[PDB]
UniProtKB/Swiss-Prot annotation:
Protein's cellular compartments: Nucleus; Chromosome
Highest taxon in the source lineage: Eukaryota
Subunit structure: Interacts with ubiquitin.
Protein name listed in UniProt: Histone-lysine N-methyltransferase SUVR4
Function: Histone methyltransferase that converts monomethylated 'Lys-9' of histone H3 (H3K9me1) to dimethylated 'Lys-9' (H3K9me2) in the absence of bound ubiquitin, and to trimethylated 'Lys-9' (H3K9me3) in the presence of bound ubiquitin. Acts in a locus-specific manner and contributes to the transcriptional silencing of pseudogenes and transposons. H3 'Lys-9' methylation represents a specific tag for epigenetic transcriptional repression.
Stretches that traverse the bilayer: none
Family: Belongs to the class V-like SAM-binding methyltransferase superfamily. Histone-lysine methyltransferase family.
Organism for this UniProt entry: Arabidopsis thaliana (Mouse-ear cress)
Domain notes per entry: In the pre-SET domain, Cys residues bind 3 zinc ions that are arranged in a triangular cluster; some of these Cys residues contribute to the binding of two zinc ions within the cluster.
Portion of the parent chain present: 1 to 89 of 492
Length: 109
């Protein structure tokens, strides 16, 4: 009136792996960028700025990285698109190519 009926088997538990990091959802942890949004407020855009994104979008470039890129050109050009567009905003090509490249190369923050 006392028999044991159980079984056991070895198992490691192999699971898949993926290298994808993105804040798809909100109201959650990983709020290290949620604050950075404040900086973008002190650096809005303009009507002409939308023109730059035109050439960038062609190469599939996000306005998030292009924002600080285009503003970098007008900085030295004192806000002159005439010259900056002398090569179809070539500056964006070499600029985005640099930033877009090497994204993991860093210590942390």
């Amino acid at each position: 009136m006392g028999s044991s009926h159980h079984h056991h088997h070895h198992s490691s538990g192999l699971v898949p792996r993926g290298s994808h990091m993105i804040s798809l959802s909100g109201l959650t942890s990983s709020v290290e960028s949620d604050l950075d949004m404040q900086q973008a407020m002190l650096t809005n855009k303009d009507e002409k700025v939308l023109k730059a994104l035109e050439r960038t979008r062609q190469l599939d470039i996000p306005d998030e990285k292009t924002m600080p890129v285009l503003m970098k050109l007008l900085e030295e050009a004192g806000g002159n698109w005439s010259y900056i567009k002398l090569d179809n905003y070539t500056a964006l090509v070499d600029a985005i190519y640099s930033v877009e490249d090497e994204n993991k190369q860093s210590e942390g923050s």
